[PDB]
Symmetry: C3
Subunit: 114 residues, 3 copies
């Protein structure tokens, strides 16, 4: 799984250990081993949500499976919870795009996961 957070919150506001917390929580939520979880946080971005430059986040979670209606609601409560607690972003100023990847469409280690 690959989780990307783009935010206007400044770099100094991202706590030490946030990448590790995201890695652990996403391993638990997806049921995938932490060795396969990649996380990427991009602070200090020029962005707006609803026309406002108040704190916001634009995110994606790509996974080979483990994507669906109920799972995505659970992921959204988890990840909005983390962004609210750790980055002080309101959940109604977060979008998360969920992408269910075919294994043949993910490259890794000189080949694909197919």
């Amino acid at each position: 799984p690959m989780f990307i957070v783009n935010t206007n919150v400044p770099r100094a506001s991202v706590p030490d250990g946030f990448l590790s917390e995201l890695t652990q929580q996403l391993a638990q939520a997806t049921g995938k081993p932490p060795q396969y979880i990649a996380v990427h946080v991009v602070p200090d971005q020029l962005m707006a949500f609803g026309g406002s430059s108040e704190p916001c986040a634009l995110c994606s979670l790509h996974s080979i499976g483990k994507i669906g209606g109920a799972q995505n609601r659970s992921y959204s409560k988890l990840l909005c919870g983390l962004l609210a607690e750790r980055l002080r972003i309101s959940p109604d100023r977060v979008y998360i795009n969920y992408g269910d990847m075919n294994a043949a469409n993910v490259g890794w280690n000189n080949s694909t996961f197919a």
Copy 2:
């Protein structure tokens, strides 16, 4: 809607008011309320288009619906027009990926839009 522009144009060349202009014009073009429009501009990027480092942009527009052949032509004329007028990027050095998101695959406000 979520609109992301990555460009090699420098930050100082992005005019004041640009995220607001994008927000307003995307609300009009997509028919979505402005409160649901998210915009993100990333200047100063290391990129090339056709092997050239002249000004260019790589963009995405994701929306729950309002994506299709005719709509996307209209969005492209709008957004290339804005990038030409405001960032001085030639329209033939812009790519925009349009993505039609299922409501169940967009997280927001601790849940999804399903």
Copy 3:
């Protein structure tokens, strides 16, 4: 085609000529003319892969066609090879999301490719 690499490798570790090498090798691999290849390298990123912050990359390749099981394996060997040789990133710390775009869903030059 549009190729994006996000990496924690520092900007000074990206060798001169790398965007041109990516452009040339993706033209050859996809069979598309280099005038249509766009490339984007984002160094100095805050990321982790499998819980650690040794060099890693999170990438995407979007193309109108030329995406499939065998092609994607070939692209992965080529691109993991380039990232290992030029950025010293281990191939098992690279993810590449391959996206097959419909022509009507790619904006360019005030219209779409439809």
